Amino acid sequence: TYCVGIRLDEGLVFASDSRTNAGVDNISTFRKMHVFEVPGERVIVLLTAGNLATTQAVISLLEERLKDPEERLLTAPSMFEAARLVGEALREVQARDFNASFILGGQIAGEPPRLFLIYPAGNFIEATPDTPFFQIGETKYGKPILDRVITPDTSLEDAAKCALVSFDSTMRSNLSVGLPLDLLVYERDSLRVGHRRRIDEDDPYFRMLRKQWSEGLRQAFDSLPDPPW
Amino acid sequence: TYCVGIRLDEGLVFASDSRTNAGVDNISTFRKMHVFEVPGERVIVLLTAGNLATTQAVISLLEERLKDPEERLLTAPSMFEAARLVGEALREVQARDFNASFILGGQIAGEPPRLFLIYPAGNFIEATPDTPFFQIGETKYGKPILDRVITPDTSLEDAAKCALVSFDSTMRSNLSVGLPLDLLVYERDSLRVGHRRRIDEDDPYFRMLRKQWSEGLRQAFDSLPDPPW
């Protein structure tokens, strides 16, 4: 479990892995990215982390077919209210280690793109130009590269590269995160899911990326100056 | 608090920061590296992490002037027995969040160089060619670069560079670790502290290193190919 959401002037980038604690001596594959789209009016993306029984129960609550006006993710009047729905659903489930955590972002027509982190307690915060990304799951291995590269001015292409490299480092160093990944790249004001795919162990691009990052890192390392000793 | 110990065919490398929880609204500087040296017979280095009252009480117990034969760190017959002394001291202190943790390494004449990790419970493990380094404190931010570079064949110079880059990434991404650092590089069979120093905010070499790593990493990143779609 590692999920990342990134917010840029140009749009949003989301990525998540699938390796999941599904009970004792059982780690299996479960998708952690969920998309709610009304093409030409809104796109909302939800990433999950923590206890699977809890996340699945939250998702089930948010999809309940006969809810009141403005109380479903598809009909929320703003992303702030959407985040509040996720948080309230989480609290409702907890009143029935079971903790869980989410990242929620997207765009609703006539409002810019926005990005939120929902905490275990069900309160939340919103990304800004100064803190333009969020992470949930096992996050510390992959944070340094995101801190080095991501700014509001970063292009969608580079932010996606940076997310993937972040996953590479995390997967090398911690066995609780693993392929397949989901990747979604959203262009500001499209109001449409533009690019979305699944990246598995055979993906040619992700293989090329890892191999060239590895070769280029080693060259950067080898050209660092020697101590005076 | 971040400390690292590394073991190579050529010798050993130790590094530690100084930013420490010293009570409520008080984070201050305390050195975390302690050296026991009998020049020409042995060198032993101890790195500390966790609760400061606990680590200081462990150190105080290990230095108690009138202990029995082979029961002080300077008179232990092997590094395995030395590690056992640290662990037993830790348990004695805990019978009087107060957890603590240590890295212990060095060389005793007629024995190769060795490196140990002492856990909070006071048991321990020893580094091998396949797992040639240990970390304590906030460790995840810095692990990926150590995993990429360190092998038994790595030179002392490169291992020290790798440790320093590991600290750089950690300090950029987490405010609980901070300068000044301590660095010690030990040559196999010298039985002497060869190189040891303190690295502060102004250190030219550490500045050089951060700046060249940063430039080289960005150029490796920028030459990666863009996602295809």
Residue numbers in the entry:
A (entry chain A), B (entry chain C): 1 to 96, 107 to 239
Provide text from the study.
We find that Anbu forms a dodecameric open-ring assembly that locally resembles the architecture of the self-compartmentalizing proteasome, but is not closed for steric reasons. The individual subunits are essentially all in the same conformation, assuming the same fold as the proteasomal β subunit.
To test the general validity of our findings, we sought to determine the structure of a second Anbu protein. Therefore, we resorted to a different strategy and designed an Anbu-1 consensus protein (Cons-Anbu), an artificial protein with a sequence corresponding to the most frequently used amino acids in the individual positions of the sequence alignment of all members of the Anbu-1 cluster. Cons-Anbu was indeed highly soluble and even exceeded the thermostability of Pa-Anbu with a Tm of 80°C. Crystallization trials yielded a tetragonal crystal form with two dimers in the asymmetric unit. The dimers superimpose closely on those of Pa-Anbu with an RMSD of 1.0 Å, and the only noteworthy difference between the two structures lies in the geometry of the helices, which is highly regular in the consensus structure.
